[PDB]
Design an enzyme around this catalytic site. Structure first.
Site, PDB file in Angstrom:
ATOM      1  N   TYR A 125       1.019  -1.335   0.331  1.00 56.06           N
ATOM      2  CA  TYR A 125      -0.034   0.064   0.075  1.00 56.06           C
ATOM      3  C   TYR A 125       1.201   1.578  -0.165  1.00 56.06           C
ATOM      4  CZ  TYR A 125      -3.570   3.056   0.860  1.00 56.06           C
ATOM      5  OH  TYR A 125      -4.971   4.432   0.750  1.00 56.06           O
ATOM      6  N   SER A 181      -5.594   0.754  -5.094  1.00 62.27           N
ATOM      7  CA  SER A 181      -5.470   2.336  -4.969  1.00 62.27           C
ATOM      8  C   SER A 181      -4.002   2.869  -4.600  1.00 62.27           C
ATOM      9  CB  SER A 181      -6.173   2.772  -3.271  1.00 62.27           C
ATOM     10  OG  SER A 181      -7.695   1.787  -2.998  1.00 62.27           O
ATOM     11  N   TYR A 182      -3.740   3.256  -3.774  1.00 61.45           N
ATOM     12  CA  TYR A 182      -1.944   3.982  -3.549  1.00 61.45           C
ATOM     13  C   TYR A 182      -1.118   2.640  -3.548  1.00 61.45           C
ATOM     14  CZ  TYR A 182       0.952   7.268  -2.325  1.00 61.45           C
ATOM     15  OH  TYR A 182       2.660   8.157  -1.606  1.00 61.45           O
ATOM     16  N   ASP A 234     -15.310   3.966 -10.903  1.00 60.48           N
ATOM     17  CA  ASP A 234     -14.768   4.161  -9.905  1.00 60.48           C
ATOM     18  C   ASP A 234     -14.351   5.890  -9.176  1.00 60.48           C
ATOM     19  OD1 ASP A 234     -13.129   5.173  -7.359  1.00 60.48           O
ATOM     20  OD2 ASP A 234     -12.027   3.153  -8.353  1.00 60.48           O
ATOM     21  N   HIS A 283     -14.393   1.743  -6.643  1.00 55.43           N
ATOM     22  CA  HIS A 283     -13.242   2.005  -5.613  1.00 55.43           C
ATOM     23  C   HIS A 283     -13.166   0.109  -5.174  1.00 55.43           C
ATOM     24  CE1 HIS A 283      -9.027   3.601  -5.783  1.00 55.43           C
ATOM     25  NE2 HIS A 283      -9.195   3.086  -3.880  1.00 55.43           N
TER      26      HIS A 283
HETATM   27  N1  008 Z   1      -8.884   4.869   5.583  1.00 51.11           N
HETATM   28  C1  008 Z   1      -7.130   5.711   6.035  1.00 51.11           C
HETATM   29  O1  008 Z   1      -6.126   4.878   5.870  1.00 51.11           O
HETATM   30  C2  008 Z   1      -7.691   6.763   5.899  1.00 51.11           C
HETATM   31  C3  008 Z   1      -8.390   7.517   7.000  1.00 51.11           C
HETATM   32  C4  008 Z   1      -8.982   8.565   7.418  1.00 51.11           C
HETATM   33  C5  008 Z   1      -9.027   9.332   8.349  1.00 51.11           C
HETATM   34  C6  008 Z   1      -9.737  10.393   8.527  1.00 51.11           C
HETATM   35  C7  008 Z   1     -10.610  10.694   6.976  1.00 51.11           C
HETATM   36  C8  008 Z   1     -10.565  10.378   6.148  1.00 51.11           C
HETATM   37  C9  008 Z   1      -9.786   9.087   5.886  1.00 51.11           C
HETATM   38  C10 008 Z   1      -9.909   8.097   4.802  1.00 51.11           C
HETATM   39  N2  008 Z   1      -8.274   7.536   4.894  1.00 51.11           N
HETATM   40  C11 008 Z   1      -7.829   7.708   3.549  1.00 51.11           C
HETATM   41  O2  008 Z   1      -6.753   7.184   3.551  1.00 51.11           O
HETATM   42  C12 008 Z   1      -8.354   8.086   2.299  1.00 51.11           C
HETATM   43  C13 008 Z   1      -7.796   8.163   0.842  1.00 51.11           C
HETATM   44  N3  008 Z   1      -8.447   8.829   0.514  1.00 51.11           N
HETATM   45  C14 008 Z   1      -7.871   6.716   0.389  1.00 51.11           C
HETATM   46  C15 008 Z   1      -6.744   6.617  -0.362  1.00 51.11           C
HETATM   47  C16 008 Z   1      -5.879   7.067  -1.064  1.00 51.11           C
HETATM   48  C17 008 Z   1      -4.986   7.275  -1.913  1.00 51.11           C
HETATM   49  C18 008 Z   1      -5.644   6.995  -3.099  1.00 51.11           C
HETATM   50  C19 008 Z   1      -6.591   6.544  -3.404  1.00 51.11           C
HETATM   51  C20 008 Z   1      -7.260   6.223  -1.909  1.00 51.11           C
HETATM   52  F1  008 Z   1      -9.091   5.555  -1.875  1.00 51.11           F
END
Ligand code: 008
Ligand SMILES: *[C@@H]1O[C@H](CO)[C@@H](O[C@@H]2O[C@H](CO)[C@@H](O)[C@H](O)[C@H]2NC(C)=O)[C@H](O)[C@H]1NC(C)=O
Ligand SMILES: *[C@@H]1O[C@H](CO)[C@@H](O[C@@H]2O[C@H](CO)[C@@H](O)[C@H](O)[C@H]2NC(C)=O)[C@H](O)[C@H]1NC(C)=O
Ligand SMILES: *[C@@H]1O[C@H](CO)[C@@H](O[C@@H]2O[C@H](CO)[C@@H](O)[C@H](O)[C@H]2NC(C)=O)[C@H](O)[C@H]1NC(C)=O
Ligand SMILES: *[C@H]1O[C@H](CO)[C@@H](O[C@H]2O[C@H](CO)[C@@H](O)[C@H](O)[C@H]2NC(C)=O)[C@H](O)[C@H]1NC(C)=O
Ligand code: 008
Ligand code: NAG
Ligand code: NAG
Ligand code: NAG
Ligand code: NAG
Ligand code: NAG
Ligand code: NAG
Ligand code: NAG
Ligand code: NAG
Lengths: 728, 728
Positions: free
Chosen positions: B509, B592-593, B670, B702
């Protein structure tokens, strides 16, 4: 050792096939582009003069992709800034060049983003389409005159076709028709208000942060269609402070009662125009010959000048009713219709009489009428040797229908079996175009002596390169299917030995009215597959295929995906029986309709085919446009042919895909067969638990014809074919 | 012989992992769903009363997916008609059921397609969102009062988030907060007028003739952002013939000046609300504590009640600043911030003072504050045994910071290293949720003596089943990268043989603030790959990863796709040294990432990786949303960080993909990482002449989380990997 025809050889086109494009501008003269010089050739002898030197192009600033000289030879039109739209449609910028004072016109220029432009057939008048409206320019340096005011994006089209009329009806963007002496300008208007929109993402250049949505008025099967209007404009009264003088010609009552199409326009005389209409159902067509009334300025129709053409077994004509070819006076015309035996032949119609006389007959079909004088009629047919995959020019005497001479049959019988022709203004000279099976050959002829005047292009430079290479052989033969003779071809690898076992690739199209098996010389992907990879590429024309009578063609009427698919299987079974064909390694591939057949074959459960590639295929007929689909399938209502619509989808055979290795390829910007088709198909295979391969092509349309995509798709298809065939 | 964990075993979930979800509704009682029965379990003793029997569900007619009991235990909310939207958002239908008369409410029902609904914290008041507007019902049988009049699809959101606030800020759909005694209803309004739309085709079911276009207000990097308004509604005056009484609280001057977000709301008392605001850049954060003025109805801010938190090296917090946890009285709060050495620890803040006191310290991080009493603070950290991929519950005395007890560490040291906790209303009892490294174990504890009251679920049934199967082992270890110790994990095949060379799959990731290496027990795709296919699956947490201090975390600030990608390559190089890893067969895959990193690794030209799979990857940061991207990358302008935006695209590494076998997968629907991303990526690879594999999934988002799509993707990824690893 000898080199083979490689994938790179095809993709980069290292083996250049030469041609001879000429433009007839008189009864004995033609123009020819030679190293960007326009040369005026004389047919009578052969001597040429410089019409426009190459240095004239160099001082324009832009790269010129097309030119058009006025019939009076006073002016030339330069086409640049070419932007492709659909199959035939495009927008461009245009400059007019004065040939008298050898200078560019810089006042009252043709606007940029011009959709269509044409010279009048006489003099130097201009008609052009811009922003869906028609403009007329009497003089190149004078201001243009607006003819229509209704032009509106995606809604109202004056002088140019909408999507469906371009692809399925006219096979052109143009909807403009100058009268022979330029008095009248006829045009069609298309109304798409109620036509539903297909929407898809165009991602464009990487720098575009947000993708855009393309929206086209595109009528899918059974959907609301575009409406059409036809106008004849009198250009004599065109003036800055005058209204536009126009008369609307409506279709005959029998067509006006329901949804219809305008499918053809033919100018007969200055005062007589012929209009070809067809009902939405497309089994009923009418020719309406309208006469100009001098005292009222009206175009009058009468029942006497109306000529009906019907089909009881299917549809009228090939993809459209054949065009009428009128005599100089216009009191009679010659037209290809189906005869009593169900073979398409030339019938002689009188303008004000309902009965016609067939001037040709036999178990073969007239392809098209090429030229007409008062004494002779010139036409193309597949009569010679009884092979429908061949084409020859024939000349029939008008006063004696028995006297018919073949002008191309015996010129080069081994080298040339497939001919097309282009005649001068009064059919005094003709260029013959040989397309195979040997190297394309371009010759000029006299009509009075039937003598070959000279060779224009024989592709000698191509012959020099091909003897260096291991060329595959193309064999054309016949097999029996359910008591019917059917033609097939095979691209056989060099050093073909019947003891060794070769893998088989079936290259298919198998669309209604289409011909996959012919005597055309082609440097193709199959050329490389046989030469380098030693694969047999076979093609077959079964039921539904054209040029062999109504019986064979109308066999798939109201049942697309049945007989033409079944015949591809049965013919391959026959091929697999032959000792030189490895039954373990049999593939099938096709483009568009060919992809649909490929898919349906692979969903058949025949066990014959190990794998296949479908490129931009139809998956469900309700997804494809109205004109094409309804022609063969009728309407998708329970009152009509819904049952046959439902059981002809590829999705209905999703379960049988588990046995085969499937490659589905589609361009995302496909305006023709929408990405939807492959998207919905893939979804039904995912749902069925079928594993398969997929390949989308970003921003590519139906041709997947951009340089790098063209290269990529064939590279990727070769890898998939080799993996399936266990080939190193 | 013993069987191995198959792909069918993962995809069908034949080995079921049980869990214990309970709802705390008092300081000593909780509800649990068992055999469709809702039972009121007592933590004090162990006896359970039948609160709602399983037959009550069956008489309603529909299938119920969620329930919510009012705090006064008078009513229960039933959730049915669940329709998914984005990650957290959904619409549902709702029924209220009286527990006194044991009757359904039929008059004045909760509307169809309700976006969000919530009980008040006391009594039985309801607030809900329907068609982007807020509605309050004082009584379940009573008529609802409209709170907002601005609700407009894709434009104005009251009480619910827009796309970006749901995904990136709140991590939830709701933007409603009842006050403790239900006097006030606080809500945010989001205005997305100037936010550009992402458009993409949704093909829907096969019967849909024309695909629809989904349009979402989605702000990509540097684009126009949603604005936010915060309101507090006094629900006392809510009456049919009355207007709504509400006050708008604005962010402090320091935040008001430019673009900003609301990232946190915390009710302190009935007259005290805490607001967390953050600047667009996300390196400046403020806590505004606002006091209700009884005489005017205003909510007042004072500089003394404002608490600034900034980052000079990167961003504030992990994905957002940590929430403040206030005492009952509301004169102080505890909040996780970064200390001197850049480790996240609990600081004790006074409400009217700026300087805070750290109550925790060390080379580890507090994950979150769970519960607070007058005596004790309960929290989760990764202190134990120095492993950042472990979690444990800790209690610290508020009068003595020396006395810190670990309540979870030594209950099952080898079975349980990863912990979660849920505390009773007054923190008198808690459930301990253990997630690994052994099978999940759910237990109940008292806070009085911290004794394991009983075992709620211990997965005995799964343990029995796991004996019959060849389970793989999970190894957690440390490697040194450029003078820093980083954590990694390896899933090793059954009966690990040191002589044989095993193929390696890297599961990545690598997103900023993320963790791929933990002690969480997971029946996964990797489980199958080790057990059946005998592949080593490894994961690694390099620079940019979280839970190890700000120094490692902020390492990739303004340079995504550099260090985290480089550390993946170099770590794998170290793994390939091991004699049991076949350096000729190393793959990398991610989502994703993880797909972005996979892609950036594959185009790095390291020669370390033979092949790789990217699932729904980011390809270019300008394509991704504002909040997430700008947090780490800043703005894509020449004045800011465009230089690093430009050189961090996968498309710029297109040339190096010729060395690897690439599989690119994306769902066409997506809404998060748009299909555009892979569409633009594939186009560049086609332009570079790179051969690669592709797989679109029609109408999947997604998560590609639909039944058949889930099955299909892993099946397709498995065949690709086997072919790459030359596995039969
Ligand atoms: N799920 C996660 O690790 C985090 C946690 C978190 C905390 C506070 C507010 C929102 C979130 C959601 N998280 C995210 O990483 C959201 C990102 N959009 C996920 C993401 C990262 C990179 C590429 C695509 C993608 F969907
Ligand atoms: C402009 O026209 C001249 C002819 O005058 C072209 O020159 C010819 O080039 C071909 C090769 O392409 C030679 O084989 C001929 O010998 C040349 N002709 C003569 C008689 O000089 C020239 O190529 C043209 N320029 C451009 C722009 O292509
Ligand atoms: C759609 O259904 C029809 C009718 O069931 C199919 O037509 C039959 O095709 C088989 C060939 O396998 C013939 O033996 C029958 O004679 C046909 N029956 C009729 C009533 O004509 C048709 O093949 C189906 N279409 C497709 C594409 O599978
Ligand atoms: C959402 O925000 C927009 C601003 O982007 C607001 O639109 C403005 O409304 C005012 C008052 O009605 C008008 O005078 C302006 O013309 C609008 N501004 C622009 C530049 O578009 C809109 O009012 C906001 N909606 C709500 C309910 O707060
Ligand atoms: C693109 O941006 C810069 C281009 O200069 C890259 O520079 C960094 O990475 C190099 C790796 O070869 C280091 O050697 C450099 O020290 C470092 N630049 C400096 C001076 O800070 C960067 O890595 C590139 N990013 C990507 C995603 O490839
Ligand atoms: N290209 C063709 O063979 C014909 C020729 C023709 C003749 C008159 C008017 C129009 C046309 C165009 N032709 C077509 O077959 C058009 C079809 N839309 C091509 C097609 C058929 C099936 C599936 C996809 C597809 F693009
Ligand atoms: C060809 O030569 C003839 C000589 O009679 C002449 O009339 C004619 O104009 C010439 N053709 C060209 C090149 O114009
Ligand atoms: C086009 O058709 C619509 C009805 O579909 C009609 O209302 C409109 O006036 C028409 N426009 C023209 C210019 O014919
Ligand atoms: C047409 O009308 C315009 C504007 O009224 C005028 O300038 C022009 O002279 C007129 N043209 C002719 C030919 O009368
Ligand atoms: C023409 O098509 C219609 C509708 O499909 C059909 O009812 C009719 O039988 C056809 N006419 C002929 C001559 O076959
Ligand atoms: C639970 O059972 C105990 C038995 O000791 C009893 O004292 C208590 O009243 C019960 N509590 C309830 C009402 O659940
Ligand atoms: C309902 O609960 C009873 C015990 O109270 C139990 O026997 C039964 O299985 C349950 N029914 C279901 C499966 O909903
Ligand atoms: C509120 O107004 C409505 C309609 O205007 C009226 O019927 C009702 O009596 C009013 N309610 C009260 C409490 O007066
Ligand atoms: C936060 O980032 C912005 C934009 O780059 C910058 O102007 C500001 O000074 C930064 N604040 C701190 C304290 O780093």
């Amino acid at each position: 050792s000898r080199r083979t025809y490689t994938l790179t050889d095809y993709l980069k086109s290292t083996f250049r096939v030469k041609f001879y494009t000429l433009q007839w501008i008189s009864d004995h003269e033609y123009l020819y582009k030679q190293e960007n010089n326009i040369l005026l050739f004389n047919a009578e002898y052969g001597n040429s003069s410089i019409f426009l030197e190459n240095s004239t192009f160099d001082e324009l600033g832009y790269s010129t992709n097309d030119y058009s000289v006025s019939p009076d030879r006073q002016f030339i039109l330069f086409e640049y800034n070419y932007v492709k739209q659909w199959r035939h449609s495009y927008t461009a910028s245009y400059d007019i060049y004065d040939l008298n004072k050898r200078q560019l016109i810089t006042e009252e220029r043709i606007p940029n983003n011009t959709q269509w432009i044409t010279w009048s057939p006489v003099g130097h008048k201009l008609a052009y389409v811009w922003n869906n409206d028609i403009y007329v320019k009497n003089e190149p340096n004078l201001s243009s005159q607006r003819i229509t005011w209704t032009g509106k994006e995606n809604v109202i089209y004056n002088g140019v076709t909408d999507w469906v009329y371009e692809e399925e009806v006219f096979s052109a963007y143009s909807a403009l028709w100058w009268s022979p002496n330029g008095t009248f300008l006829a045009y069609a208007q298309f109304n798409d208000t109620e036509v539903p929109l297909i929407e898809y993402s165009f991602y464009s250049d990487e720098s575009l942060q947000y993708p855009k949505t393309v929206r086209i008025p595109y009528p899918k099967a059974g959907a609301e269609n575009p409406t059409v209007k036809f106008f004849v404009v009198d250009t004599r009264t065109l003036s800055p402070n005058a209204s536009v003088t126009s008369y609307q010609i409506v279709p005959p009552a029998s067509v006006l009662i329901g949804d219809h199409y305008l499918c053809g326009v033919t100018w007969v005389t200055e005062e007589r125009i012929s209009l070809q209409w067809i009902r939405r159902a497309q089994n009923y067509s009418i020719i309406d010959i309208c006469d100009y009334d001098e005292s009222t300025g009206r175009w009058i129709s009468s029942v006497a000048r109306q000529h009906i053409e019907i089909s009881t077994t299917g549809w009228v004509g090939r993809f459209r009713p054949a065009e009428p070819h009128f005599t100089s006076d216009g009191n009679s015309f010659y037209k290809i219709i189906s005869n009593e035996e169900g073979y398409k032949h030339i019938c002689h119609f009188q303008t004000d009489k309902s009965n016609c006389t067939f001037i040709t007959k036999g178990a073969w079909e007239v392809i098209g009428i090429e030229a007409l004088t008062s004494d002779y009629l010139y036409y193309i047919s597949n009569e010679h040797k009884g092979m429908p995959g061949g084409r020859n020019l024939y000349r029939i005497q008008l006063n004696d229908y028995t006297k018919v001479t073949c002008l191309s049959c015996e010129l080069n019988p081994e080298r040339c079996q497939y001919y097309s022709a282009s005649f001068s203004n009064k059919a005094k000279y003709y260029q013959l175009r040989c397309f195979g099976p040997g190297l394309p050959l371009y010759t000029l002829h006299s009509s009075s002596s039937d003598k070959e005047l000279r060779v224009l292009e024989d592709n000698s430079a191509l012959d020099k390169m091909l003897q260096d290479v291991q060329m595959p052989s193309k064999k054309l033969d016949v097999i029996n299917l359910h008591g019917t003779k059917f033609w097939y071809q095979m691209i056989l690898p060099p050093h073909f030995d019947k003891s060794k076992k070769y893998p088989l690739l079936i290259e298919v199209y198998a669309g209604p009215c289409s011909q996959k098996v012919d005597t055309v010389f082609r440097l193709s992907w199959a050329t490389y597959l046989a030469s380098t990879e030693n694969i047999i590429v076979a093609s077959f024309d079964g039921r539904g295929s054209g040029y062999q009578g109504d019986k064979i063609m109308h066999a798939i009427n109201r049942r697309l995906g049945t007989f033409e698919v079944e015949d591809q299987i049965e013919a391959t079974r026959q091929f697999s029986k032959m000792g030189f064909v490895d039954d373990k390694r049999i593939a099938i591939w096709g483009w568009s309709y060919g992809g649909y057949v490929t898919s349906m074959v692979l969903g058949a459960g025949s066990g014959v085919f190990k794998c296949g590639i479908a490129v931009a295929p139809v998956s469900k007929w309700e997804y494809y446009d109205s004109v094409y689909t309804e022609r063969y399938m009728g309407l998708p209502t329970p009152e009509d042919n819904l049952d046959y619509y439902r059981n002809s989808t590829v999705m209905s055979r999703a379960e049988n895909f588990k046995q085969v290795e499937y490659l589905l390829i589609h361009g995302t910007a496909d305006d023709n067969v929408h990405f939807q088709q492959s998207a919905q198909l893939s979804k039904a295979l995912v749902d069925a638990g079928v594993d398969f391969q997929t390949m989308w092509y970003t921003d590519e349309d139906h041709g997947i014809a951009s340089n790098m995509a063209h290269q990529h798709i064939y590279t990727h298809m070769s890898h998939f074919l080799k993996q399936c065939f266990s080939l190193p």
